[PDB]
């Protein structure tokens, strides 16, 4: 799914009563991974202590 | 007005979100004056072309 923003008209406080505030909610979904590890070559410059 | 972007985070299912309100700044630009002046005579104004 893409980027979606939803508007929350009413927030609550520690006693389940309105506290005069609102907010914006946004969320996103994605996933990825490598299938074949031998189709790449990566160079590492490691420094000894 | 200047600011920075919000910070997202990867969250699990049914995981409470954390507020990411940004911070704001304000530059200021003063305005100053420069001037120049030159006096002339009547005969100099009438003679020199």
Automatic annotation (TrEMBL), chain B:
This is Phage capsid-like C-terminal domain-containing protein. It comes from Mycobacterium phage Che9c. It is found in: Virion. The chain holds residues 298 to 346 of 543 of the full protein.
